[PDB]
Structure formats: structure tokens, C-alpha cells
Design a protein around this motif. Structure first.
Motif, PDB file in Angstrom:
ATOM      1  N   UNK A 170     -12.542  14.341  -3.178  1.00  0.00           N
ATOM      2  CA  UNK A 170     -11.446  14.108  -2.457  1.00  0.00           C
ATOM      3  C   UNK A 170     -11.424  14.615  -1.112  1.00  0.00           C
ATOM      4  N   UNK A 171     -10.648  14.235  -0.396  1.00  0.00           N
ATOM      5  CA  UNK A 171     -10.662  14.258   1.093  1.00  0.00           C
ATOM      6  C   UNK A 171      -9.880  15.489   1.600  1.00  0.00           C
ATOM      7  N   UNK A 172     -10.280  16.302   2.556  1.00  0.00           N
ATOM      8  CA  UNK A 172      -9.347  17.335   3.079  1.00  0.00           C
ATOM      9  C   UNK A 172      -8.194  16.858   3.894  1.00  0.00           C
ATOM     10  N   UNK A 221       0.853  -1.278  -0.016  1.00  0.00           N
ATOM     11  CA  UNK A 221      -0.110   0.038  -0.068  1.00  0.00           C
ATOM     12  C   UNK A 221       0.909   0.971   0.028  1.00  0.00           C
ATOM     13  N   UNK A 233      -4.037  11.358   9.678  1.00  0.00           N
ATOM     14  CA  UNK A 233      -4.753  10.182  10.316  1.00  0.00           C
ATOM     15  C   UNK A 233      -5.796   9.470   9.348  1.00  0.00           C
ATOM     16  N   UNK A 234      -6.260  10.184   8.504  1.00  0.00           N
ATOM     17  CA  UNK A 234      -7.529   9.560   7.929  1.00  0.00           C
ATOM     18  C   UNK A 234      -7.244   9.596   6.331  1.00  0.00           C
ATOM     19  N   UNK A 235      -6.033   9.837   5.726  1.00  0.00           N
ATOM     20  CA  UNK A 235      -5.543   9.802   4.400  1.00  0.00           C
ATOM     21  C   UNK A 235      -5.752   8.127   3.953  1.00  0.00           C
ATOM     22  N   UNK A 236      -6.465   8.026   3.045  1.00  0.00           N
ATOM     23  CA  UNK A 236      -6.789   6.941   2.209  1.00  0.00           C
ATOM     24  C   UNK A 236      -5.549   6.106   2.136  1.00  0.00           C
ATOM     25  N   UNK A 237      -5.207   4.761   2.036  1.00  0.00           N
ATOM     26  CA  UNK A 237      -4.395   4.006   1.607  1.00  0.00           C
ATOM     27  C   UNK A 237      -4.811   3.495  -0.051  1.00  0.00           C
ATOM     28  N   UNK A 238      -3.984   3.523  -0.903  1.00  0.00           N
ATOM     29  CA  UNK A 238      -4.214   3.031  -2.099  1.00  0.00           C
ATOM     30  C   UNK A 238      -3.107   1.726  -2.255  1.00  0.00           C
ATOM     31  N   UNK A 263      -5.764  15.245   6.259  1.00  0.00           N
ATOM     32  CA  UNK A 263      -5.643  14.751   7.532  1.00  0.00           C
ATOM     33  C   UNK A 263      -4.807  13.517   7.370  1.00  0.00           C
TER      34      UNK A 263
END
Lengths: 189, 189, 189, 189, 189, 189
Positions: free
Chosen positions: B132-134, B53, B138-143, B136
Motif C-alpha cells: 500500500x501507499x503512504x 474514477x 497528490x499521489x494517491x491512485x485513482x481506481x 499523499x
């Protein structure tokens, strides 16, 4: 650019049966090389872990038994730590346990018992003189992660008591390594 | 098994000359993909960095000039952060700077001046909706680190003021990435 | 470049009369899209509010009655919050109130009574899986303000008890939105 | 409904060469209008920023040079703030710098040097009397954002020393404005 | 209307015998879907648990052995957590343990030993990009409890060492779920 | 495995007109059963809420009027709580209000006024002896959620004053229940 990780490898070891009546022991050696844990890479990166230097911190040798708990003719052996590439000669049925009086001896209950050894190996820098460093995390030498010619690390010798039945083991070696200087190469495509 | 590292890549960009007298701007876009920074591996490891990841934390785009400090017909442009894959249309000589009133506009002094932009890109999960996400950590998506089909990250658009002379740049993109789940495979040999 | 504002829109809804004697309910759905609140702009600015991104924070649906306070054959209904684009099927005279046991049910007194619902909608990112985020002001996704293809937000379903007389309503939806990245374009003239 | 934002605009200015031997100065004026920064809208919204009132808080005039740092025949000029629409008459080669003894004079190094001026302009309410307010953020008048007839703001005059070579500039004006009373109109479609 | 509960399911898995002498491993995958734990309901309630939304918090996979403690030819395997729907290819006799160097590897003692894994799965929202969220109880997405088309959750892959004897297991998966919005429908009778 | 929820049900009640001149009252009874709120399930789960035991905590009976606020010949009635299945006999035009002197009497204003009653019912365990428990949340009996034979709960009787015009009501009963021992059954498919 430090990266501590963990690399493993699994292989077999068997102590064949003997008709000998006496208690005899089977002696063998165990070396550790990083080529057996780290495969070759691809392209401009010669190895699969893109780093330049390494140094092995610890090794965990696990003798996972293959024999049932109902197997008889049980025995008692010894595993010792040999940091210099001069092991007791390999023997099939030796009349004594050579590694028994060693300060690093741990008893091996046989055949259906688990045996672990956790220690810090040493590299074979000069086999003629056989010199090594004491344990110091801050002063441990960094070796180079060669392409296909890495140096053998050393540190375990065993003595298993023979039996009428074959004693098989699945040996899992885990090396805890520490790399340095991330050196990835990114050509175009 | 986290491993924060840094991957770089260098390429060129030129703003060709124009006989146009007015102040016109040249618009272009800039996407970021990990295939251009991480090559393919070799063997059972499909990539050169043995992880499963990833998630891109930051990118540093550096416009390193190629032009002398004596070059005239200087100009003024703008670089903005576009996290949604809908850029201003690519133009050769547009009569205005579209990225000038953007909240993320930084002025580009031209031609012999260095321009850096340090920001957090976003992946193109759905180009139809463009969500898209703001920011963060701790909350950033794993690709997933795919083999040859990774998703394009996005986040920079530029507007350079044209000139009588050619304006060349060597653009160095540096991605600060964070991997997970060391997945090295070690077959025998 | 944040700008919190408020956009409104007004339209009608009628529950036609029925000769049915039993208590039956009329079921209907209600979606929310930003095209119905934000018109198209003019020129290089495709929309009338010059921003790139948006995210809907809250919606206020107000059922303003059209019927006198002397109207009889009164009834009792239910309004529920449905954040997934799978509503109870539209029905003219259903033998029960489907939205009555919902955790988000508010009673609708009919016909001459005001009913408000204030909630946070969710966008339809994938209608096949129908996934949505919980309420978090800091982690709410930013969508793109498209030109003519914005995504439908969802979140209200109703059940009105039928009557001998027609029950008309003027429904005023107010969306509390939050934009980002002021992107005005100023060509010459 | 306050919304502070920033609007920009870029244009050129050239001081043509002169064979005159003496030190002469070229005088010119600079006004600011919001039509040049805010385009017309579309539909029921006459402007692209949907607000009723405005008041200009600050302006930043930036003289970005177009000339190389090797250019000779350098000079020295002056920029002053003129809040009343009575500038020194435009001149090609005047024998002195009129704006030199002004209390708001900043020196302009020429030709390859950047010059910024950050100030609060004033509107031309009556050109016959030419009255204006002192700086007060709380008491500053609100003007109406007209459709195509906004009033000219004023506040900069310049004096550039002529040269044997042409001195070109790219002037970027940035107005920091404050709007009021969001007035979006949303007809059906 | 939150309701945390626990749903279970039991099924078999067998690793067939092999005459191969070497240590080879048998690779397989394991997905989790809620249709296999939650049956269809009856009537106006399409499911047996009357709720609208759900999100899987944890899963407990238990390998309960079927083999006696006297069985020989023991082995050693690995179970890893794979949150992206790209498993190691299913293999009958692979020459190595692929999941051994994974950061989420737990050793599987075989054949008569219990193995548990307790983790948080992730849904397959886009198999092309394979993106997932980190662990956050407050920000975890709510999915819809579909009628017959729920999405597959993912998160376990195994590697069992083959043997001369058949190794059978009874696998009990327990999903700890969290529902929302009680939606019971009560028609007359 | 406790789960407190809320179940509702709606039905009609009409007090027909009478030519009688005197003030007479119409008496009727009201029982509560869980079959009317909880439908039958499907498959191995006999009920739609998969639980074994239940106990009714509270009931809310709401008399929602159907009559206009302009209706004359108004009246005054009484609603009392009858926890023993021995109601006043059903009467069309009784010469007095029997439930008026009851300690649990609430006045019913008629015809266009809302009347609520919120109380704790009791089950009919033995209709011959008619015994019930006092209010104690900790000691309240758990009943079994039968398949099609649940026991009737009891607790409301009414007396409505007759009128020249028909007085219609839509009665909404809401039971606040508490279940126990989640008993979902998941066969294969």
C-alpha cells in the motif's frame, strides 16, 4: 453541495430547398429542457445525477454545418435570443428576416459556416405573464430536478435564408448547469 | 472533473453475552467497499453517480451505542487501523486484547460510549504481497468505479470486552470520496 | 510506530577454476529476501521483530575476499544493479563481461580486493510486467511482514573473471529496513 | 540502539462486599514486572522484543470501572506511590485510610469513576536496604532484559472504601519502556 | 542513463458509409504498445534501442485526413481520454455520442479537418482493478522493456459521425519515451 | 539528437619471457575501432545503437595486471600517445625505450601495477598525409557510423621491459562516444 458541470446533446436541423426566386427566410424556434440532457436514473435515485435542485447558468448552441465549402446560393440570416416563449411564427418562406433588427441579433453566414451563441436562458414559470429575471448569478432561482416533468427553458430563435440546395446542420447544445443538495440513496442489497 | 462528496451507510454490530468470568475480548474485522455506499444506476449509466474514477480519501467509523447509561459490567477495548487485509483472527472470547499495543490503538470505553475513528484506508491491490501507499493526497491512485466488482478497502479492526449483558451498536460508516471524469450518457427517448 | 534498524547475513560464493586460456567471465545473480535476515518468532508473535509492515530502504553487499594478496592470475569484473528480476543468464565461462556497459557498473578488482555496493532495491510485485518505483523515501510502498512467504527483493548481478585458481568470497549483505505498527501480543501465562 | 515503545496489560480487581456498618477501607498493593508485558520469544532470541537492556520510564495505571453510574453506597479512597516494596499490610476492612496523608495521594472516587496514576517506578535492587534513584532521565540505570527472571518494579498502593455492593475494576497498566542494543540473531534455515 | 527520445508510427482508419438517415456515431478504441514503435534488435541485444527500462511520458495522436475539402455531409464527433482499458463498446451506428459529456472531450470536426490529442497514457498493470497513477514526472513508474511481451498503454477513445461517403484517416501516433540503464552488449567477432 | 554514452571492450596482452640479460624493451601498438565496441544490429537497423553519426571524445586504456605482487625482475616502461598511424616498429627485444623522451610519456611500472591513459584519439582520414585536428569539442568532426567499414582511430603506443617471467595483462578499453541523429526504423510485423 454545489457541483457545476456541463451537459451536451446533438441533433439535426435542415432547411429544405425552394424554387422561390425571391430572398425568403425560414423561421424556427429552439427551446431547452433538461430531460433531453439528463436521462432517468435507476432505483431509489430517480435521476442519473444525484442532486435535488438545479439552475441553468449558460447554454452554447453550435450550428455545425453539414454542407461543403463549394456550395453556392449562399445567404445571410439572423439568430436572436428570446427569453419569453413567444417566438415569431414558424414559417417556410417569409419575405423578410424578422430577427434582423433585434438587439441580440448575430448574423448567420450560410451554408458552410459555423455559428455559436452563448447566453443565459430563462425558465417558463408563467407562460401567461411571461416574466423572467435579469442576469444575476447570486439571485438566480433554483428549480427542482423533477423526475419526468421539468420545465422548458427558452432563449433562441433563428431565421435562415432559403436556397436551391438543402442546407443541413448538426446542432450541438451544451448546457452549463449548477446542482445543489447531493441526495444519493443507498439501500441494502 | 473533480467532485468531492460524502457517502454514508449504517448497520448493526452486537457483542453477545458470555458466562465466562475472566476478562475476555471479542475480536472482529471491518472492511469498506463502495458497492455498499453507491448503488447501481439505470440505463446507459451503470452507476448512480456518473463518474469513471474514484479514490477514497477518508473514512469515519462511528460506533453509536444502543445501550443505556445505567448498564453495568463495563469494559475497555481497542480499535486499530489495519491497512493490509491480515487481521487478528475473529474470536468470541480471547484472553487478551490483541490491538492494545498497536500504535494506532484508541481505547473503546464500553458499553454506552461513542467511539469514532477517522483515517485514510488503502485498497487491496494484491492480497498476496499486501502493498500500500503512504498518505499523499497528490499521489494517491485513482481506481475505476466498476459496475459490480469494486475492490475492498481495508483499515479497521476492533476488540470489545465481553459482558454479562448484550452490547449492541449501530455503526455508521462515512466515506469521503473524490471522483473524476464525469461520464454521463444521454441517449434519446 | 517507526523503527529503523539494520539486519545482516553472511554466506559464501566461489568462482571455480578453469583450464580455459581466454578471458572468460562467470555470471551469477543475487536476490534479497527478508526471511533470510529475520527468523520466525515464537507464540502469538509470528516474527522475531514485532511489527506489521516493512520497506527496505537500502542494501549493502560486501564481497569480503578469502584469497591472499599474493595470488596471481588477477582479473577484472563488473557488478550492476538489476531491479527487475531479469538477469543475464547464469554462465560458467562467457566470452565477455555483460555488465560492463551498464550505467550502474562498478569495477570488481579480483581476487583479493574488497567490493561494496550500496543501493536501494525494489520488490517483485509482478514478474510478468516487472514494474518498480523510482527512489522516493516518502512514497515508497509499505509491504507486509508475512509469516513465511515474503516477497523477493532484487538488485544485483555480477560478472567475475575466471582464473586458474579458485576465487572464494564471504558475502555479507546488510539490509537497512524500516518497520511500522508495533504489534506485540501479550497473552497471560 | 534506542527504541522507546509502549506495552500494556489488563487484569481485574474486585473489592468484595461487607456487612460492616462503619467506614472501613480495603488495602492492597501493586507491583510491575516486565515478564507480564513482554512474552518469551522463540529460538535464538529469548524474548519477543530483540533488545538487551531496558529501563522503565513511566507507568500509567488506569482503574476502569465495571459498575453502573446508578450504584449507591459510594465512597472515597486514596492511591499513593510507594517506591520501596514496603506497603501497608493488606487488609480487608481497616478502620482508616492509611494512604490519605501521603504526599502522593490522589483521591479515588468510587465506584463508577475513572482513576489514573502516571508516575516513574523504581526497581527493587536490594529489598533489605530499599534504595532507589531520584527522577533523572539521563542517569536512570539500565537493567538487563533477562529471559525468565526480571526484577519487580514497584510504585503503587491503594485503599478502597468498602461497600454493601461488590466493586469491580478492570485495571490496565501501560509501561513506557526504553530498550537498547538491538541483538537479533539470524541463524540459517 | 536517461535518454528522452521520440518514436512514431502511422496507420489507417476508415469510417465506412451508411444509408442510415439519422445522426449516428461510430465508436472505436485506441491502445498504445511499444512493440509497434520499437522493433526487435539483433544478437545479444534483444531490442533495437539498447536500454533496460522505459516509461511513456506523452503520446500525440494525429488524425490526418484523407478526404478533400469539398466533401459534404460533414459531421461532429468527440475524442476522450480513457486511462483504464474499459472503453465504450465498439459500435457501427450508435444513436448518440457517448464521449460528448466526458471531461476530456475534444470536438472532432469531420471529415477534412485535423485533430490532435496530446496526453499522458497509463499502463495496464491490473485489468481487474484498473488502477493508475496521477501525473507526476518524478514518481512515474519505470517498466521493463521486454523482448516480445510489453504491456499495453491506454488512453484514447473516439466517436465519429457517420456519413454517406467514406471517411478515411491516416493516424500518426508519436510516443515520447524515457529510457534508463544503457545495456549494450559487445561480444567479440 | 545527441546521446553521450560509454562503450567498453576487454582483451589480453602478454610480454613473453626472454633469456636476454640486457635491459630490452618490447614495443607494440594499439588502435581503436568502433566495430569492436558496437556490434551489428538486426533488420532495417544495421547497428545496435540506432544513430547515424558519431565522434569519439575520449578513450581510457587500462592495463589491469595479471601477475602477483610477489613477482620479481621488475621493470620500467613507457606509454605514449601517437595520433598519426606511424608507430615505432614492433619489436621483441629492443635495446632502448623509444617512447621515453616523448612529451606524452607516462611511466609504466611493471609487472603488477595498474596503468591508465585517458586521451582524445584522432581518426585516420588520410594515411598518406596523416593530418588531424587539435582538441576542440565544438569543432570535432562527425563521422558516419558505417555498417561494417568504420575507420580506425589511433593514439597509443607502448614499450614494456622484458623479463625472465611472462607478464600478462587484461586490457580494458573504454570509448566515450557522442552520437547524433537517432534513425530508428520501425517496419510493420
Amino acid at each position: 453541495g454545489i457541483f457545476n458541470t456541463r451537459l451536451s446533446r446533438t441533433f439535426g436541423y435542415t432547411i429544405k430547398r425552394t424554387t422561390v426566386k425571391t430572398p425568403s427566410w425560414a423561421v424556427d424556434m429552439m427551446r431547452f429542457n433538461i430531460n433531453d440532457f439528463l436521462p432517468p436514473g435507476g432505483g431509489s435515485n430517480p435521476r442519473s445525477v444525484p442532486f435535488e435542485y438545479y439552475r441553468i447558468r449558460k447554454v452554447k448552441v453550435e450550428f455545425w454545418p453539414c454542407s461543403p465549402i463549394t456550395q453556392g446560393d449562399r445567404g445571410v440570416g439572423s439568430s436572436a435570443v428570446i427569453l419569453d416563449d413567444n417566438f415569431v411564427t414558424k414559417a417556410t418562406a417569409l419575405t423578410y428576416d424578422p430577427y434582423v433588427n433585434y438587439s441580440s441579433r448575430h448574423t448567420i453566414t450560410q451554408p458552410f459556416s459555423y455559428h455559436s451563441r452563448y447566453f443565459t436562458p430563462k425558465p417558463v414559470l408563467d407562460s401567461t405573464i411571461d416574466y423572467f429575471q435579469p442576469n444575476n448569478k447570486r439571485n438566480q432561482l433554483w428549480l427542482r430536478l423533477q423526475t419526468a416533468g421539468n420545465v422548458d427553458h427558452v432563449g433562441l430563435g433563428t431565421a435562415f435564408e432559403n436556397s436551391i440546395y438543402d442546407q443541413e446542420y448538426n446542432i450541438r447544445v451544451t448546457m452549463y448547469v449548477q446542482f445543489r443538495e447531493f441526495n444519493l440513496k443507498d439501500p441494502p442489497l
